[PDB]
Write a protein that binds this ligand. Structure first.
Ligand SMILES: N[C@@H](Cc1ccccc1)P(=O)(O)C[C@@H](Cc1ccccc1)C(=O)N[C@@H](Cc1ccccc1)C(=O)O
Ligand SMILES: [Ca+2]
Ligand SMILES: [Ca+2]
Ligand SMILES: [Ca+2]
Ligand SMILES: [Ca+2]
Ligand SMILES: [Zn+2]
Length: 316
């Protein structure tokens, strides 16, 4: 839409108040003109045709219950854009300020979110397994990071390359969560998962096995479900990433942590400079070591920590 930039106010999925960048032209639209070529949020109206209708509101106030997932998708896409730009100097997911589009209210009781090759899509959840998925900043960043990966490494979504693809999305989803300083943790999906159960989450980076995912290469899933276990074997890389950042002793191997900022810098460089569509875990290790080398030198601690971390999860 062509119109005047302005700022609206609303309440997100978790009942928190926030301001959002809108555009005025008869109606107020969920269109943010302050970031690249824009952030656009659409109403899919419980159907599965996409993108649906650009979100329009009569008074620039978004306190209706139906409004909540739109508010959060719009706002958290903005935060995620700011992260990539401010921290990694990347302009949107393609690096050339591509417009970011999201649809909410996809289908009925849909317990998932996804990037469809062109935009982000969020279900409302069934109210037992999930609440509307856009309420989790680690969810939103997970999804936008799939876009970044597609435009960079292009990791195919099956077997080991697909688990790397998934790990990258969980890792940057977590880094954005810390960036926004929004009750940050090394857990995945805790804000929107199982609203009847406190303290849990969909996945854990600090301890994947807590929710049944492998934390060692020896325990990798070798079947064909979940595209050869992309959301399962991701736990092996998530643990590795957690150790590089935070440190720890895992299966007898001790890792000195180097912190989140360096974690992000090393994995961003690996993703954008060295990974390929068919990279496997062993190639990821090579890429990570080379990136750390690039950044910190071959006899640095950072390089040492990267090696220890992959050793700890059994990836040579
Ligand atoms: N590509 C998505 C999966 C998909 C494939 C094909 C078609 C549609 C959707 P994703 O990884 O982005 C989904 C991702 C969303 C998420 C991210 C962070 C935090 C929470 C949720 C994800 O991990 N989804 C789980 C959702 C889920 C868990 C338990 C029950 C039912 C569904 C899965 O698909 O495995
Ligand atoms: Ca309104
Ligand atoms: Ca959190
Ligand atoms: Ca989290
Ligand atoms: Ca829960
Ligand atoms: Zn994913």
């Amino acid at each position: 839409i062509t119109g005047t930039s302005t700022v609206g106010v609303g309440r997100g999925v978790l009942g928190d108040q926030k301001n959002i960048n809108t555009t005025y032209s008869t109606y107020y639209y969920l269109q943010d003109n302050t970031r690249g070529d824009g952030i656009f949020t659409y109403d899919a109206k419980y159907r599965t045709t996409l993108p649906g209708s650009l979100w329009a509101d009569a008074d620039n106030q978004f306190f209706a219950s139906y409004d909540a997932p739109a508010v959060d998708a719009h706002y958290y896409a903005g935060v995620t854009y700011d992260y990539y730009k401010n921290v990694h100097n990347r302009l949107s997911y393609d690096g050339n300020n591509a417009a970011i589009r999201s649809s909410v209210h996809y289908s009925q009781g849909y317990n998932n979110a996804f990037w469809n090759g062109s935009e982000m899509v969020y279900g409302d959840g069934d109210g037992q397994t999930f609440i509307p998925l856009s309420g989790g900043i680690d969810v939103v960043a997970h999804e936008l990071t799939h876009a970044v990966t597609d435009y960079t490494a292009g990791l195919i979504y099956q077997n080991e390359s697909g688990a790397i693809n998934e790990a990258i999305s969980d890792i940057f989803g977590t880094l954005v969560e810390f960036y926004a300083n929004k009750n940050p943790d090394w857990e995945i999906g805790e804000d929107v998962y199982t609203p009847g159960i406190s303290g849990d989450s969909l996945r854990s980076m600090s301890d994947p096995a807590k929710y049944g995912d492998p934390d060692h290469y020896s325990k990798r899933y070798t079947g064909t479900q979940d595209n050869g276990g992309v959301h399962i074997n991701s736990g092996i890389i998530n643990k590795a990433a957690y150790l590089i950042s935070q440190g720890g002793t895992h299966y007898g191997v001790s890792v000195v942590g180097i912190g989140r900022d360096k974690l992000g810098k090393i994995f961003y460089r690996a993703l954008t400079q060295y990974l390929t569509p068919t990279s496997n875990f062993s190639q990821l290790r090579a890429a990570a070591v080379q990136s750390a080398t690039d950044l910190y030198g071959s006899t640095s601690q950072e390089v040492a920590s990267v090696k220890q971390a992959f050793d700890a999860v059994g990836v040579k």
